[PDB]
């Protein structure tokens, strides 16, 4: 029985990056070369170990994290980067050895007049830790004045809408992203290549 990669890669809608989804894959056969060749991807960068060689290992669990960011932000989805997306939305560890896959989704996630349903976190007191996920919605205090939960001067709502439009330049268009991470425990290793 084949691993259910399709319900992640071919999902009708994706999550806002601040509210990124994780899918656990287990108990199945996974062809990472035939997934390389599922379709045409704009980015498919595997850190550490090749895909053809991934087909010869086994793991306890593989995790598929997915979300939407701007094309120019995909370079932040890599170990050791910074910027608003790595700092406040989705963070990979320096020692990451999984894969990052991305493709242009202008046709699906942009709307005339702006798709305002995809958001990112713009303000945060501190940086995320690797694989942290912060769906908090508390008003951010930019100054000395307390905020008490009301927006105003120096008191900002922390999430910002991308407003994806079909006519944005390519660097600004929506990109769907999938991050593969590979977990091996002291337990049976049940996801393997054929």
């Amino acid at each position: 029985n084949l691993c259910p990669f399709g319900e992640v890669f071919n999902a009708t809608r994706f999550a806002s990056v601040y509210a990124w989804n994780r899918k656990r894959i287990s108990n199945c056969v996974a062809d990472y070369s035939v997934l390389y060749n599922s379709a045409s991807f704009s980015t498919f960068k595997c850190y550490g170990v090749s895909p053809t060689k991934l087909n010869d290992l086994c793991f306890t669990n593989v995790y598929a994290d997915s979300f939407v960011i701007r094309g120019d932000e995909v370079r932040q989805i890599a170990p050791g980067q910074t910027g608003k997306i790595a700092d406040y939305n989705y963070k990979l560890p320096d020692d990451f050895t999984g894969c990052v896959i991305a493709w242009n989704s202008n046709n699906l996630d942009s709307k005339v007049g702006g798709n305002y349903n995809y958001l990112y976190r713009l303000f945060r007191k501190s940086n995320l830790k690797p694989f942290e996920r912060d769906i908090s919605t508390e008003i951010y205090q930019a100054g000395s004045t307390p905020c008490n939960g009301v927006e105003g001067f120096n008191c900002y709502f922390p999430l910002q809408s991308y407003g994806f439009q079909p006519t944005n330049g390519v660097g600004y268009q929506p990109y769907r992203v999938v991050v593969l991470s590979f977990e091996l425990l002291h337990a049976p290793a049940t996801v393997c290549g054929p």
Partner: antibody, heavy 124, light 109 residues
């Protein structure tokens, strides 16, 4: 006046490599998305590749994906196209052309200026 | 086959009018105004003649005009002159570059 000055064409055997370059003058290069478009003899314009202003986003036609790499050097006002594993059917004139990006939007006057075009011939 | 469909050949006598059509879909020509037209003489780069469906750059003859209806754009050239003989390409770049296949315009002699 806006100018795009191309160089680097020529004759190469199938399997070989070439690097095309396009040097921009007369406009703020880092505010422009840049594209390569090619035209095989007697045929239409075929879009090939795009790079965003920052250089962080690149896309390719299926016909060249995996073999061509677009890149830019904003501090040198330069756009490049690295062409590897060339095949007969890549024989064409290659043009660079700009798309100004204003307020994150494509301007209505996209491809308003083009390079002069360089011939790439893949033959043995 | 090109993404946008144009006729291969159009022609008219000197002084007359001619129109070149460009058919796409509701998600390019039908849905957006990023419709441009390019002129190409043998041996030279494309030159922008019409943009935003109907607007012309300074220096382009006002004998060139553009319009659209439904999913079809039209380039019209009135008062034909010998120097108009050329290939013409329509394009739509509403987020994805879509070129027409090109029309050869002949000015009949």
């Amino acid at each position: 006046e806006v100018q795009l000055a191309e160089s680097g064409g020529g004759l190469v055997k199938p399997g070989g490599s070439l690097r095309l370059s396009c040097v921009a003058s007369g406009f703020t290069f880092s505010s422009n998305e840049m594209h390569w478009v090619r035209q095989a003899p007697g045929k239409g314009l075929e879009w090939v590749s795009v790079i965003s202003e920052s250089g962080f986003t690149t896309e390719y036609a299926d016909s060249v994906k995996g073999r061509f790499t677009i890149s830019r050097d904003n501090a040198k006002n330069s756009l490049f196209l690295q062409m590897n594993s060339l095949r007969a059917e890549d024989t064409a004139v290659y043009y660079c052309t700009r798309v100004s990006i204003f307020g994150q939007f494509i301007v209505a006057t996209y491809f308003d200026y083009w390079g002069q075009g360089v011939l790439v011939t893949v033959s043995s | 086959q090109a993404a946008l469909t144009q006729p291969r050949s159009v022609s008219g006598s000197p002084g007359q009018s001619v129109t070149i059509s460009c058919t796409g879909t509701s998600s390019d020509i039908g849905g957006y105004n990023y419709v441009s037209w390019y002129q190409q003489h043998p041996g030279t780069a494309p030159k922008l003649m019409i943009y935003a469906v109907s607007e012309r750059p300074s220096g382009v003859s006002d004998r060139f005009s553009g319009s659209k209806s439904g999913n079809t754009a039209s380039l019209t050239i009135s008062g034909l002159q010998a120097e108009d003989e050329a290939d013409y390409y329509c394009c739509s770049y509403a987020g994805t570059v879509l070129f027409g296949g090109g029309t050869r315009l002949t000015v009949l002699g």
